[model samples]
Target: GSSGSSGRTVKALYDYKAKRSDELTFCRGALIHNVSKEPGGWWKGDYGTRIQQYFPSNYVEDISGPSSG
Candidate 1:
């Protein structure tokens, strides 16, 4: 495949703190990589890779641009 799921990049619009064991906490403007879209409009991304968690896709913005290649 010429295009693959190497990853998508995004930034958090709001700050969040993990309240559950499976949640990841991140601050506003935190750059996230390898963001995966899940069912029900949820997203799975990591902050520093050690803490990957689910988030509402509404609060995140896609800043990735089209490929030049």
Candidate 2:
């Protein structure tokens, strides 16, 4: 069970398919979660959906920081 801030946005660079339990699939241009661990390609965030999962960092780019209220 993991979660991230609601204001973070990650841009998918390419399509990916989850191969392991710590992996997630995403399409290009898809907005993903920003709770990704740096230096490592392990992401546990959402992609417009509430379902949080881990994805690769090589497949997406951290567009911006978490939003401020």
Candidate 3:
């Protein structure tokens, strides 16, 4: 039973674009902590920078558990 139970763990994905073309795009998957609250989450702002001007506000946040399939 334990072998089948291992699939219960949740996962999350974070995505960000590369600073230059031909550079690898950033992507990561992290284990989801079951607790209701997330701790010490922080991010940087590229505000007022030339590079920031070129990008659009496509940022999104979502929560989806694994499919039963």
Candidate 4:
């Protein structure tokens, strides 16, 4: 029942929790927008956890001209 926004799914989960449903089913129905499922790295720590944010900014810069130029 997703629509124009993630708000709809969030609202649905709220309703479900209010009724005191089973935690398993409740968590299953919860909405998680922009969540990362990437594998974690020991050296990187939480890098993969925030990959979506850093990737876009660094990726564009790396492909473009030198920042100092």
Candidate 5:
């Protein structure tokens, strides 16, 4: 978890409903785990057991890293 693009985490800033078969619908404040940003403002990752699904990058931001300092 030190380099090579970590599979970090993020949190939704708004409720993004799935508009496409490849997108992942998520509510605000939902923690998106195993997050890895993809091309074209897209995030490739999973939420719960949803598996790796596409999420809009603007709809979420990183909430991982810097823990319990």
Candidate 6:
């Protein structure tokens, strides 16, 4: 079962390393799902199905929903 909608989407600006055990490491241009309230430079979200962790805010760009033309 899904944990429900995260309500926001984001994309990686550059490759990042998981400094903590709960953080997810992602390469440049990777899509991140369900971003949470970022308290510091670290942002939390899910990468695919099995990877859920916090990544640096500077490492990602905000995608404003899906594009439909």
Q: lDDT of each structure?
A: 0.72, 0.69, 0.30, 0.22, 0.82, 0.75
Give me the runs in candidate 2 sitting further than 4 Å from their true place. 1-6, 48-50, 65-69
Scored by lDDT, model 1 comes in at 0.72
Tens digits of per-residue lDDT, candidate 3, 8-66, equal 22233555555764222333443322212223432212222221122211332334455
Judging by lDDT, tell me the better candidate of 1 and 3: 1
Lowest-sum lDDT 10-residue window in model 6: 48-57
Residue 5, candidate 2: Cα error in Å is 4.5
Give the 10-residue window scoring lowest on summed lDDT in candidate 5: 1-10
- Residue pairs with colliding backbones in model 5 are none
The per-residue C-alpha lDDT of model 6 at residue 22 equals 73
Q: Model 4 off-target regions past 4 Å?
A: 1-26, 41-69
Q: Quote each prediction's TM-score.
A: 0.72, 0.64, 0.20, 0.19, 0.78, 0.68
RMSD of 3: 13.5
Model 5 misplacement above 4 A: 1-5, 67-69
Compared with the true structure, the alpha-carbon lDDT of candidate 6 equals 0.75
Per-structure clash totals for the candidates: 0, 0, 0, 0, 0, 1
- lDDT of candidate 2 vs native? 0.69
* CA lDDT, candidate 5, residue 55: 84
Q: After superposition, how far is residue 27 of candidate 6 from its true place, in Å?
A: 0.7
Report the C-alpha lDDT of model 4 over 44-67, residue by residue, as the tens digit. Answer: 101222222211111111121254
Q: Model 1, range 11-30, lDDT digits (tens) per residue?
A: 87988767776776777888
lDDT of 6 at 69: 54
Question: What lDDT score goes with residue 64 in model 1?
Answer: 82
Residue 63 in candidate 4 has what lDDT?
20
Tens-digit per-residue lDDT, 3-55, candidate 6: 54566778888887777767787889998877875656776678865355777
Q: Once superposed on the true structure, which residue ranges of model 3 sit more than 4 Å away at CA? A: 1-10, 15-27, 37-66
Root-mean-square deviation of every model:
4.4, 4.4, 13.5, 17.3, 3.8, 3.4
lDDT of 5 by residue, 1-69 (tens): 445455699889998788887989789999888887765678778887677798888889888887788
